[PDB]
């Protein structure tokens, strides 16, 4: 039994997965297959890929934001915080937490007496009045006030944080602005924004309108228009309502507004249209937005305090009141018609709409500015409106992290002082910190969970509740036994005997003795002379004491005994328990004045109760056993001869009571996976993919026999390069060139015109980007001789791998860069800097490129430069990937030590998808998407290899790419200050900052000098073998060439045109037998499943075997003869079911051939690969052979195969690159799924579709699990 790791490759249409074991191998396992076939076992490698469409299904609905889900899981956090306070709160005010809960259903009092309740609302009209008072508090503060402050934050927080989210050092307008442009530049490498010398803090946090601050900023970004994408983001974060339809050429108007209730959903619908690459862009806009709005706000306050947001909000409160007071007088007087429109009508923008009706600030100003301009005396009101300062409200801070940290600061201030008076607060600092800050996936160990023990979030009954005391008395009686004159054994009290006894004895005396039970009931009523009694001792312990209490006050025994007042009386005792003061009781009691005299109500209002019980009504009287329909109290009252009691009933498996209690302990023990994923920023596809990833990992752990993996290594699927977004890139390069040639005033586009699609050539682009000139030497280049010239890396590959235009120049010879191993030579910078500057200002190089060319002027590559290179390659910054990491980390690491620290047995590693992509290129494991779907699985395999190699080779780097709170090492203390300082395994890890250098056997320096590395890489300190260049590359080639890879096209049952939910197999009469395929529609579905046969009969079928009605969802998979597979699609059509595998030798060949000219890389190494393509021309035959063999066996499109085969022979002499590029088209004949037309050479090959679904009814149905590892096969031939 050995350790393993999982690699994951998460995409919007595909989850790829791979388990790897020691020495980076992929294990295999035999898997029992179920059903009616004579195949009972199958052997399977543990590597696969799940493929899924993204449409209207129930799983889609589950991943939508769901309010009742949020409510319930948030109630766990609220309730947990109450539990921590419950003990000390009991000493201050035992009814506090129950009082607040009753008032949750008023949509109001917080205190027991009228004095405190009035004094609380006079002093704390807002939560910020409270916070500020508490922070300023020198001595012990009232615990209710402390609780109320904390509870208000966690009640109204949109979403809590995960590890690595807090960043308090970079929470200011300027850095958040850079973050936005950096995130923007990641997505638009050709038209990046230079933000150098832009005072964004001053421009964006001014006393000017949003619209002016937009124009001011956009005016400082050369070439950027106000309604362009970057302007609209700035518009978004300033508080405006930009429209992104034109930036992305969208279908409809798609406008966005941060303050709206629907913004979160609105963003996901946009991402669903433009791609989840953009999500972090709109997240950067949100945090900037928050930093802007907090500066404007905090500016009003002038008092030095640990509650600066509170101090500001109090000020704005007072200013809001005066301004509203005047506006009301102005309107009442000058425009009384419009008063109710303005101040009461939430349906309209206007004050009412603005506050209680979700109209935004700008919508409100837009409505009210004309009203103000037409009135007298609105001069400064209008001034405030135009600097965005008029009647700001208080609720502008529930979401986002920049907000969260400001709140946490104030609350931590309160807790630090109040810890000195409430030891329990120091005792639970970390628990309370977790409640205030972070996601709580589970309430176990230190966070394990007044409230009803059985039902966690349900509150208890008052201990003097009449219903509670009935439960107490009946629970005791149901275990009394009696024995009479005519009996051999004792018997239980009857349903009627119990009621008889309660009516007769428990309602006439406070305590009931056993003598009374014997004499006053068993003698006098049942006429017995000898009676012995077990189950009770001197007297019963349970008393109906509140019945007797009220009997003296009401003096209407009929009223007490009447079952319909039971909840009236329950309400009365609740009220007499929650409050302690006659005026406040009598307020609440006044609704019952039609039921009692004033004589009685003066008496009732004086009858306070104190105390709370152990159980809640819902449990005792509320939940009902399914079959019997009876509550627990019902069973205590009568339960046949069984006479179960409370503790019996809870645990009896023959009653649903047990199961409902467990269903509630489960819901209250942690949060909701689907709610978590539902609230991420992303499309519904990215969310479906994350849910699949969680499913795949669960099944993989089941497969490895419940053993957890050592590491899980996650990457986000690298995206395919469509030719559509490929030509969008040409248009972008063209616009950057045109705009740059204009500002240079150079005639180069007229001397050499160029259509945009030619700019895809690296060298030609660089030639225009460089205005026709060498970049290291003052000279022109000849546009007709670019083949002779070099592409040089500004920062050498030894230090960072960056093959972008932003790290490349076009020289005559790379020797022109200078002779150093570092950035270009100081002699080159001098002769060329002024040219570079001109280019930089023309936006033909970037600020990063310029700084890098000139770096020799500043001492070359510093330690700091190198440490940031490390982080640049390691750290994956996408947000959603941090949440995938936590979700898996949450599920995997659940035990706690004897410290109350998390024991991390599974390390969840996150890698940039680039690392794997570079690895395939650096070591020739080339990817050719077109062949099959295996490359998803291959990526997950490679990702698991590269991730687990890194963590073993460079453990100290853990903190940068493993989820968790790890010891943060400074990367610069890991950087050797000379290369010879690294020949030994001292603590320094690198001199040449490409972290992937340890895989290479020889590294080439920028000048040409070559450093060798040992064939076997060991970790410095542990000595462990990490990578053996002699074995481990071969292992990888083996896994990739491996032909059987588990591919699963997720089947779907639809939910949103005659749309079918799923087909079904009917075997029946119409007499003689038919095997038919019938599609149930979404309307039909409800009916059909209710009564299958009656639905089926009314369709003309009869004498159907209902045990042979097989449900067949979309893409059900069938196997026929010779392993030919078919998938069942919609519209009575079948899809191709087989995946065609090719070994590495062929894949690499096809790749390097189709790239024979486009060959970026070393000039000698470029020929070594061209030689390989040449010397293996015979692979063209070998491939065509496999494609043909595959096609005749499973494709069955003999017509097109002949055309293809004929056309291949005729063109066998065209250059190799051409035949390969055209073989790569062929694979769409063999591709799994819907057949689709393609072109081979000149020839067009039209799709042969599969129009008869009859075929499958006698084939074998293959039902796959998510990994495809567990099959159950059903031979329909024998049906």
mmCIF file of N, CA and C in Angstrom, residues 146-201:
data_model
loop_
_atom_site.group_PDB
_atom_site.id
_atom_site.type_symbol
_atom_site.label_atom_id
_atom_site.label_comp_id
_atom_site.label_asym_id
_atom_site.label_seq_id
_atom_site.Cartn_x
_atom_site.Cartn_y
_atom_site.Cartn_z
ATOM 1 N N UNK A 146 -21.103 44.659 23.438
ATOM 2 C CA UNK A 146 -20.034 43.980 22.711
ATOM 3 C C UNK A 146 -20.614 42.995 21.714
ATOM 4 N N UNK A 147 -21.539 42.139 22.174
ATOM 5 C CA UNK A 147 -22.094 41.147 21.268
ATOM 6 C C UNK A 147 -22.749 41.822 20.085
ATOM 7 N N UNK A 148 -23.592 42.825 20.356
ATOM 8 C CA UNK A 148 -24.343 43.464 19.289
ATOM 9 C C UNK A 148 -23.426 44.006 18.207
ATOM 10 N N UNK A 149 -22.324 44.631 18.608
ATOM 11 C CA UNK A 149 -21.377 45.122 17.618
ATOM 12 C C UNK A 149 -20.837 44.002 16.748
ATOM 13 N N UNK A 150 -20.311 42.927 17.355
ATOM 14 C CA UNK A 150 -19.818 41.814 16.551
ATOM 15 C C UNK A 150 -20.914 41.197 15.694
ATOM 16 N N UNK A 151 -22.082 40.928 16.285
ATOM 17 C CA UNK A 151 -23.120 40.244 15.534
ATOM 18 C C UNK A 151 -23.562 41.038 14.317
ATOM 19 N N UNK A 152 -23.587 42.363 14.412
ATOM 20 C CA UNK A 152 -24.025 43.167 13.283
ATOM 21 C C UNK A 152 -23.103 43.002 12.085
ATOM 22 N N UNK A 153 -21.793 42.899 12.316
ATOM 23 C CA UNK A 153 -20.882 42.720 11.189
ATOM 24 C C UNK A 153 -21.110 41.403 10.478
ATOM 25 N N UNK A 154 -21.130 40.302 11.240
ATOM 26 C CA UNK A 154 -21.229 38.957 10.675
ATOM 27 C C UNK A 154 -22.626 38.672 10.132
ATOM 28 N N UNK A 155 -23.641 39.389 10.614
ATOM 29 C CA UNK A 155 -24.957 39.303 10.008
ATOM 30 C C UNK A 155 -24.952 39.842 8.587
ATOM 31 N N UNK A 156 -24.295 40.972 8.364
ATOM 32 C CA UNK A 156 -24.490 41.679 7.114
ATOM 33 C C UNK A 156 -23.342 41.535 6.138
ATOM 34 N N UNK A 157 -22.286 40.800 6.503
ATOM 35 C CA UNK A 157 -21.169 40.579 5.596
ATOM 36 C C UNK A 157 -21.641 39.766 4.401
ATOM 37 N N UNK A 158 -21.282 40.211 3.207
ATOM 38 C CA UNK A 158 -21.610 39.442 2.032
ATOM 39 C C UNK A 158 -20.977 38.071 2.095
ATOM 40 N N UNK A 159 -19.637 38.025 2.111
ATOM 41 C CA UNK A 159 -18.869 36.785 2.102
ATOM 42 C C UNK A 159 -17.607 36.925 2.922
ATOM 43 N N UNK A 160 -17.244 35.848 3.598
ATOM 44 C CA UNK A 160 -16.042 35.822 4.408
ATOM 45 C C UNK A 160 -14.851 35.330 3.586
ATOM 46 N N UNK A 161 -13.664 35.463 4.183
ATOM 47 C CA UNK A 161 -12.370 35.300 3.532
ATOM 48 C C UNK A 161 -11.834 33.861 3.661
ATOM 49 N N UNK A 162 -10.798 33.569 2.866
ATOM 50 C CA UNK A 162 -10.047 32.326 2.959
ATOM 51 C C UNK A 162 -8.597 32.721 3.167
ATOM 52 N N UNK A 163 -7.728 31.711 3.304
ATOM 53 C CA UNK A 163 -6.310 31.958 3.544
ATOM 54 C C UNK A 163 -5.667 32.784 2.432
ATOM 55 N N UNK A 164 -4.709 33.619 2.824
ATOM 56 C CA UNK A 164 -4.011 34.453 1.877
ATOM 57 C C UNK A 164 -4.812 35.603 1.316
ATOM 58 N N UNK A 165 -6.041 35.835 1.799
ATOM 59 C CA UNK A 165 -6.838 36.940 1.267
ATOM 60 C C UNK A 165 -6.435 38.286 1.877
ATOM 61 N N UNK A 166 -6.146 38.339 3.186
ATOM 62 C CA UNK A 166 -5.844 39.623 3.818
ATOM 63 C C UNK A 166 -4.563 40.237 3.258
ATOM 64 N N UNK A 167 -4.634 41.534 2.959
ATOM 65 C CA UNK A 167 -3.480 42.308 2.502
ATOM 66 C C UNK A 167 -3.674 43.734 2.980
ATOM 67 N N UNK A 168 -3.298 44.026 4.236
ATOM 68 C CA UNK A 168 -3.592 45.356 4.802
ATOM 69 C C UNK A 168 -2.602 46.427 4.375
ATOM 70 N N UNK A 169 -1.428 46.025 3.872
ATOM 71 C CA UNK A 169 -0.375 46.934 3.440
ATOM 72 C C UNK A 169 -0.644 47.537 2.066
ATOM 73 N N UNK A 170 -1.501 46.898 1.270
ATOM 74 C CA UNK A 170 -1.826 47.327 -0.086
ATOM 75 C C UNK A 170 -3.350 47.483 -0.206
ATOM 76 N N UNK A 171 -3.918 48.344 0.644
ATOM 77 C CA UNK A 171 -5.353 48.591 0.741
ATOM 78 C C UNK A 171 -5.692 50.068 0.497
ATOM 79 N N UNK A 172 -4.793 50.778 -0.215
ATOM 80 C CA UNK A 172 -4.915 52.194 -0.546
ATOM 81 C C UNK A 172 -5.159 52.400 -2.042
ATOM 82 N N UNK A 173 -5.738 53.561 -2.364
ATOM 83 C CA UNK A 173 -6.238 53.852 -3.710
ATOM 84 C C UNK A 173 -5.159 53.699 -4.770
ATOM 85 N N UNK A 174 -3.928 54.135 -4.471
ATOM 86 C CA UNK A 174 -2.858 54.081 -5.465
ATOM 87 C C UNK A 174 -2.486 52.639 -5.845
ATOM 88 N N UNK A 175 -2.155 51.793 -4.860
ATOM 89 C CA UNK A 175 -1.790 50.416 -5.185
ATOM 90 C C UNK A 175 -2.958 49.655 -5.764
ATOM 91 N N UNK A 176 -4.169 49.947 -5.288
ATOM 92 C CA UNK A 176 -5.289 49.227 -5.859
ATOM 93 C C UNK A 176 -5.493 49.633 -7.305
ATOM 94 N N UNK A 177 -5.148 50.886 -7.637
ATOM 95 C CA UNK A 177 -5.182 51.332 -9.026
ATOM 96 C C UNK A 177 -4.178 50.564 -9.873
ATOM 97 N N UNK A 178 -2.946 50.413 -9.382
ATOM 98 C CA UNK A 178 -1.929 49.677 -10.135
ATOM 99 C C UNK A 178 -2.368 48.233 -10.355
ATOM 100 N N UNK A 179 -2.849 47.591 -9.282
ATOM 101 C CA UNK A 179 -3.428 46.255 -9.363
ATOM 102 C C UNK A 179 -4.427 46.148 -10.511
ATOM 103 N N UNK A 180 -5.334 47.119 -10.624
ATOM 104 C CA UNK A 180 -6.280 47.122 -11.736
ATOM 105 C C UNK A 180 -5.569 47.145 -13.083
ATOM 106 N N UNK A 181 -4.581 48.040 -13.263
ATOM 107 C CA UNK A 181 -3.947 48.159 -14.579
ATOM 108 C C UNK A 181 -3.043 46.963 -14.845
ATOM 109 N N UNK A 182 -2.370 46.459 -13.810
ATOM 110 C CA UNK A 182 -1.604 45.226 -13.952
ATOM 111 C C UNK A 182 -2.505 44.072 -14.375
ATOM 112 N N UNK A 183 -3.616 43.875 -13.661
ATOM 113 C CA UNK A 183 -4.578 42.851 -14.049
ATOM 114 C C UNK A 183 -5.109 43.083 -15.457
ATOM 115 N N UNK A 184 -5.299 44.351 -15.850
ATOM 116 C CA UNK A 184 -5.745 44.689 -17.205
ATOM 117 C C UNK A 184 -4.673 44.356 -18.232
ATOM 118 N N UNK A 185 -3.408 44.644 -17.908
ATOM 119 C CA UNK A 185 -2.331 44.427 -18.864
ATOM 120 C C UNK A 185 -2.067 42.945 -19.081
ATOM 121 N N UNK A 186 -2.307 42.103 -18.057
ATOM 122 C CA UNK A 186 -2.236 40.657 -18.253
ATOM 123 C C UNK A 186 -3.125 40.217 -19.403
ATOM 124 N N UNK A 187 -4.243 40.892 -19.611
ATOM 125 C CA UNK A 187 -5.225 40.460 -20.587
ATOM 126 C C UNK A 187 -5.086 41.154 -21.933
ATOM 127 N N UNK A 188 -4.306 42.227 -22.025
ATOM 128 C CA UNK A 188 -4.147 42.958 -23.280
ATOM 129 C C UNK A 188 -2.666 43.281 -23.480
ATOM 130 N N UNK A 189 -1.874 42.222 -23.680
ATOM 131 C CA UNK A 189 -0.435 42.358 -23.837
ATOM 132 C C UNK A 189 -0.045 43.290 -24.980
ATOM 133 N N UNK A 190 -0.921 43.495 -25.967
ATOM 134 C CA UNK A 190 -0.540 44.332 -27.100
ATOM 135 C C UNK A 190 -0.841 45.816 -26.870
ATOM 136 N N UNK A 191 -1.929 46.169 -26.189
ATOM 137 C CA UNK A 191 -2.230 47.559 -25.854
ATOM 138 C C UNK A 191 -2.271 47.770 -24.343
ATOM 139 N N UNK A 192 -1.141 47.563 -23.659
ATOM 140 C CA UNK A 192 -1.088 47.814 -22.219
ATOM 141 C C UNK A 192 -1.063 49.292 -21.897
ATOM 142 N N UNK A 193 -1.390 49.575 -20.646
ATOM 143 C CA UNK A 193 -1.532 50.926 -20.138
ATOM 144 C C UNK A 193 -0.303 51.253 -19.308
ATOM 145 N N UNK A 194 0.360 52.370 -19.624
ATOM 146 C CA UNK A 194 1.450 52.867 -18.795
ATOM 147 C C UNK A 194 0.852 53.804 -17.766
ATOM 148 N N UNK A 195 0.925 53.420 -16.494
ATOM 149 C CA UNK A 195 0.365 54.208 -15.403
ATOM 150 C C UNK A 195 1.419 55.021 -14.654
ATOM 151 N N UNK A 196 2.607 55.180 -15.231
ATOM 152 C CA UNK A 196 3.712 55.802 -14.518
ATOM 153 C C UNK A 196 3.449 57.286 -14.345
ATOM 154 N N UNK A 197 3.667 57.792 -13.133
ATOM 155 C CA UNK A 197 3.443 59.202 -12.880
ATOM 156 C C UNK A 197 1.999 59.635 -13.011
ATOM 157 N N UNK A 198 1.068 58.755 -12.668
ATOM 158 C CA UNK A 198 -0.345 59.084 -12.575
ATOM 159 C C UNK A 198 -0.678 59.104 -11.097
ATOM 160 N N UNK A 199 -1.141 60.245 -10.596
ATOM 161 C CA UNK A 199 -1.537 60.342 -9.188
ATOM 162 C C UNK A 199 -3.005 59.955 -9.089
ATOM 163 N N UNK A 200 -3.232 58.636 -9.005
ATOM 164 C CA UNK A 200 -4.593 58.114 -9.030
ATOM 165 C C UNK A 200 -5.314 58.432 -7.733
ATOM 166 N N UNK A 201 -4.580 58.415 -6.618
ATOM 167 C CA UNK A 201 -5.152 58.820 -5.341
ATOM 168 C C UNK A 201 -5.726 60.224 -5.429
#
